[PDB]
Amino acid sequence: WTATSGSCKGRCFELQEVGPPDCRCDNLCKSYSSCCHDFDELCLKTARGWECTKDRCGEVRNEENACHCSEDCLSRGDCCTNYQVVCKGESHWVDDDCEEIKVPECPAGFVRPPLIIFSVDGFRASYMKKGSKVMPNIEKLRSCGTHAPYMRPVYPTKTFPNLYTLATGLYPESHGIVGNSMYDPVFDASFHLRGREKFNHRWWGGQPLWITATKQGVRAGTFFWSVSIPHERRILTILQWLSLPDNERPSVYAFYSEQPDFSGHKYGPFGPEMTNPLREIDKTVGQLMDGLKQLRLHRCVNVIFVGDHGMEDVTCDRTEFLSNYLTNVDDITLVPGTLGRIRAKSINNSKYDPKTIIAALTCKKPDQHFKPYMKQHLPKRLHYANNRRIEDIHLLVDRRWHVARKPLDVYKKCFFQGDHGFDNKVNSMQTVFVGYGPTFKYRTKVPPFENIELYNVMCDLLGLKPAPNNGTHGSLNHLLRTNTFRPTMPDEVSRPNYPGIMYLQSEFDLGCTCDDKVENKLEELNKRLHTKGSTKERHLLYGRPAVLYRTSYDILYHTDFESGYSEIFLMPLWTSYTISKQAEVSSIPEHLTNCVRPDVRVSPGFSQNCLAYKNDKQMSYGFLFPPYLSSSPEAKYDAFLVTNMVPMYPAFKRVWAYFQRVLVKKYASERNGVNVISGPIFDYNYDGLRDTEDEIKQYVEGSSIPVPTHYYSIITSCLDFTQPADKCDGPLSVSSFILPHRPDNDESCNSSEDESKWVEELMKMHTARVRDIEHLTGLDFYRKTSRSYSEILTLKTYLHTYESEI
């Protein structure tokens, strides 16, 4: 109960919320049904509209008006935003030439440039170019400030997950807002767009920017505006707050627009009805900038213009129906639409089997427009699994499509023409970023980047220490004129051993054989040098990776490759090699077909063994450095060492072999040499982080050889591809992947065909950031380059998406 009998007089849009049954006058009261009786009258004034006119100039103040055109309004801070334009001969901000803002130009009493975050719902990245003629305020922000061609949202590309990632720097799996709809089985409670449960604080994890600021003594305006407060009032309230005394004035502010998303759902991303919403958004930005200019704040405030996600063409007829695949359709609950999440309708049903649901949904129609996954098999780049609110079964839906449970759900619940929610690499889901102000750069374009990075930057802009988050702090330093964050490289925790020859062949009883006893001071001194690391400068281009946890490992040198070999996991953590443009591919000779050779630098006790593989009828093996790319017939013997071997399902070897035999040489051709680092990943609890030894759920039968959940590779070359990978003077170019190590190829519906028809498509789906691989391995790459550390942090956050041009 709210006894709504108090007054909002002198209290309108109060920053500090009061505890009911005291009524409330803050911009959330409407959402809680708790406003005082006079809230509309006093706080939502609309009399005379939003703009000064020639006849209103110099008027006698009338407190009933929405905004004012009287002489006293500027000091009072409540003029209509076009006041000085209409009455004092001033130009609109959009009509002024832009001029570099080298330093903040702020009124006395400002301790730091304020930050204003203007967020737009459903603002697709291509609107900046395509709508440019009708958005001149936005175009000026964009061209005069710092801008990216687009900003990558998080998955799912829905509103709440993305706005909360913007606020926290966290993946949805960590912040807890994993969709627009959710069931939490621990609370046994549901979260929905409509309703009140979404306001309960138990949904919202991490630490959002407004709490980070408050806790560190920086005051914050509101971020969540009640839908019924018009845009013009939100702007005037921000302008009013900026006129408060120094000790009361917030330093951070947010404005939110429900558009263009609201219209885009009805008309599609490029419907002719979309012009007007973009015009209206531009006019609101114009009102803010004119307002800031009136207050002499337009060269003081940092402004961010940012979207949550884009918008795609989606109509009712493009719906797949689970009732077409499942007979048991009423025994499941589907969270539907641009993604699917399935769980049992009833937990008392012991006949419910996710395995048989997956099988009934796998590759059943020729052009099937969704693909089923256990959540732990989703591409690791989506970071969408480590939350009890994410159902074990997930459906990834093709762009332009919907999934629903039954046809009745679609015509009993065509209206819409746009929607979003799809895979976050999809071009139509991409959104916008512009920063404009003293702290951003002038007329600068920066590469595309992920929205998880912005929290850190907003903290930098406000001089705040960010809470622990998934951004990589420093990776966006190139956006900023000053206030950069200067990170140091993490300290290596374990130093390596460098073993020499310490074991005789006969000490190994591994059940391994090799036709290798087919036997000179030229090339015996030579092979000794190679084993001591004579070629290491060629294969380890950026220094050895640092191991950031306590463990026992050895560096192993060879003619063609270098590895860091784990005595705990019995295989390399990483294997590094360079393949020049001119390198040649050879085959595994017949005499070496099943050859595995003991490594005399490494004890039998710390070695894999061939008998385990023989005995394990499911598990085979592959090699991290490919025998196909050996530099000479003699060097090829190194690739068959037991220390270069890793466990692989036969289904996975089809993938791995095509990558190693065909694709590495192809990339070396296209890129002028590549350096490759490959290795295993163990993530049995799907939390995106390196497993400890006691977390491993599967071993090669009868042995202590742990089975990787994934295999990675990081492929680096010179950004200027006129220089070879091993002789690069400037910036680097990277692409990486984290391939799931699966015992079938059910994921790929075309896998009965030749690897050339399906493997590359699989790898593209499992594209990754070096940073993703770091989390997953506890390794730190690129320790020794001639490049700045911030540039390397940007490189580590890069994602090769394989999409066409935006």
Ligand SMILES: *[C@@H]1O[C@H](CO)[C@@H](O[C@@H]2O[C@H](CO)[C@@H](O[C@@H]3O[C@H](CO[C@H]4O[C@H](CO)[C@@H](O)[C@H](O[C@H]5O[C@H](CO)[C@@H](O)[C@H](O)[C@@H]5O[C@H]5O[C@H](CO)[C@@H](O)[C@H](O)[C@@H]5O)[C@@H]4O)[C@@H](O)[C@H](O[C@H]4O[C@H](CO)[C@@H](O)[C@H](O)[C@@H]4O[C@H]4O[C@H](CO)[C@@H](O)[C@H](O)[C@@H]4O)[C@@H]3O)[C@H](O)[C@H]2NC(C)=O)[C@H](O)[C@H]1NC(C)=O
């Ligand atoms: C992205 O960035 C984020 C932020 O850096 C990373 O997430 C962090 O990962 C850490 C490692 O997993 C994790 O550290 C653990 O924290 C536990 C205490 O956590 C509470 O307090 C913090 C701090 O205020 C708070 O943020 C947490 O909030 C979580 O939980 C609430 C719900 O209760 C949610 O509202 C919120 O959204 C968030 O949930 C998310 O994280 C949890 C895991 O914490 C997941 O379960 C959820 O799915 C969701 O993703 C908490 O309120 C602490 O207890 C842990 O300590 C145990 O494990 C360590 C290992 O070192 C061990 O030493 C300890 O002894 C202890 O073990 C004992 O307890 C075990 C478990 O009960 C038990 O099995 C053992 O037997 C032992 O007795 C641990 O230190 C940190 O909480 C999260 N933070 C956040 C915000 O998510 C994330 O890794 C990054 N992602 C990537 C890919 O890099």
Ligand SMILES: Cc1nc2cc(OCc3n[nH]c(=O)n3C)c(C3CC3)cc2s1
């Ligand atoms: C820059 C940022 N803007 C916002 C804006 C936000 O909310 C904006 C908002 N106001 N009214 C409404 O319906 N929405 C969605 C939120 C809340 C959803 C959490 C976080 C952030 S972080």
Ligand SMILES: [Ca+2]
């Ligand atoms: Ca893990």
Ligand SMILES: [Cl-]
């Ligand atoms: Cl959802």
Ligand SMILES: [K+]
């Ligand atoms: K086997």
Ligand code: NA
């Ligand atoms: Na298949």
Ligand SMILES: [Zn+2]
């Ligand atoms: Zn929407």
